[PDB]
Amino acid sequence: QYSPNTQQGRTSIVHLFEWRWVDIALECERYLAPKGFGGVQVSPPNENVAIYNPFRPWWERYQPVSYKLCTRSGNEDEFRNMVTRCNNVGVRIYVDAVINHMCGNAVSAGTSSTCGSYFNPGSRDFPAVPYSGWDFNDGKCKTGSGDIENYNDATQVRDCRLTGLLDLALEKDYVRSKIAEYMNHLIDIGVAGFRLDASKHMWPGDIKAILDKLHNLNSNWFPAGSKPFIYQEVIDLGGEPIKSSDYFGNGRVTEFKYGAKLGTVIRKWNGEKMSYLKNWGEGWGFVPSDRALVFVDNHDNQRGHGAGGASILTFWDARLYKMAVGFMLAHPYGFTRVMSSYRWPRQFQNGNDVNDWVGPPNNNGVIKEVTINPDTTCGNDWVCEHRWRQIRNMVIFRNVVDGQPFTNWYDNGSNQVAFGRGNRGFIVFNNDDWSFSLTLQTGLPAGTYCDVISGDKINGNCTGIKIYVSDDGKAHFSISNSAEDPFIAIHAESKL
Ligand SMILES: O=C(/C=C/c1ccc(O)c(O)c1)N[C@@H](Cc1ccc(O)cc1)C(=O)NCCCOc1c(-c2ccc(O)c(O)c2)oc2cc(O)cc(O)c2c1=O
Ligand SMILES: *[C@@H]1O[C@H](CO)[C@@H](O)[C@H](O)[C@H]1NC(C)=O
Ligand SMILES: [Ca+2]
Ligand SMILES: [Cl-]
Predict the structure, then answer these.
(1) Strand (E) or helix (H) holding 421
(2) Does residue 491's CB lie within 6 angstroms of at least one atom of ligand 1?
(3) What domain range includes position 494?
(4) Site: Transition state stabilizer. Where?
(5) Which of 200, 314, 422, 475 is 20 to 30 A from 216 (CA-CA)?
């Protein structure tokens, strides 16, 4: 459950948040395969509540109505077509599995669902599964409200309703079996693994019992005996009894401390600075690298009041964001996920975004296609961070340097830092308010290297900055604090 099942030499996944299946299939073929991406995290592919007040928010997809593969992203045939096409070009699909709960307990009964299935939250009836009142934790939860009230009580966090979401009785074999039926449908279609949503709200042993029912990956594409990659969304910032280490026997865990601390460092909050990153990793209190799924932002916390609050860097902070993503992609800790977002009309009032609910770009609720512009950016309000040169080229950097040790660290005691990855790559950052002009030991063979942040190696030439490495491994780097991107990265495949 710990290995991503990507092709060898592909080292990241991208979250194509709220993309339609047909667009992901095209993206696999036209971009993700040639540019070296390992795979895609898809939005929940199972039927959810259609919420009209407010209008079709992104978070309606975290309120299941059934396990039918029928959503605003597409139907089952479209989902299978995407998985097949992506696997055929060596790009994997990871499903966001929403298995702790069904929908909010106060949602009105009827057929306001993405496939038109009937459901009745008040009577606990989800006949398209089917689930009934016997399948929820109403009787087990001990709180006065029936909801989670106190995170210092690890029992209620698991047995009670997360903000009113009907909480499935995951101890029951019937419920475990319905969830496994859904997940095995997906595995047998060709999915490579799963994000387990809301894992802090599930007992480690109930997750384990579900995972014990799962198939090995589809043997038309994967070697015999391949296990699905499992990454559990456990929000653990310290200071609560539940620790993400309780989940290590099941799979990897999301390390939310990663982006929270990287954001505070790059924003220079509370006296933090990039020179402190020399011991980045477990020395900062993080989970072991081989259990970490890391990221700068995710779909919830890029809206500013998730895990990390206001420290989280996002595409709205483009210059600092590219630097944070670049640091992450260069550094060996963890398995990396890149976010790919849509734009929305962010409107802060008293420090909070009143439009944080807005769903993906749409015409009357129908998600818009992803259009590709001639400069390789996207239209229709899709941000496509994964197509930004500075991010895509760092996804490639991470592939090129895979397995190489962290070495040749330099810092100026402030915010000018650099490090290498064995003899295969080197990266230099200037986050101080002055210039960074210095000769550094790079660990690389002598030659001329293209900076892949300011440009590309194309037709045996560099389109941006060129770096000259001497016989001693040293090279001169100059980065003004006014540069478009105040970091430079070079690697073995950017050498002329
Ligand atoms: O803001 C949201 C949704 C956020 C959200 C959705 C999926 C996630 O994986 C996630 O991490 C956050 N939802 C809105 C509106 C809402 C939706 C449903 C509901 O029952 C109540 C309200 C909201 O304001 N939610 C309250 C704050 C966010 O509280 C939620 C968390 C959450 C946040 C921080 C934590 O430390 C934690 O343990 C859980 O996880 C969810 C998981 C879900 O599967 C579905 C949810 O509705 C939620 C969810 O509401
Ligand atoms: C590189 O650029 C130079 C100058 O534009 C050009 O003469 C040369 O043909 C290009 N390609 C190679 C492989 O040198
Ligand atoms: Ca639960
Ligand atoms: Cl996540």
Answers:
(1) strand 416-421
(2) no
(3) 404-496
(4) 300
(5) 200
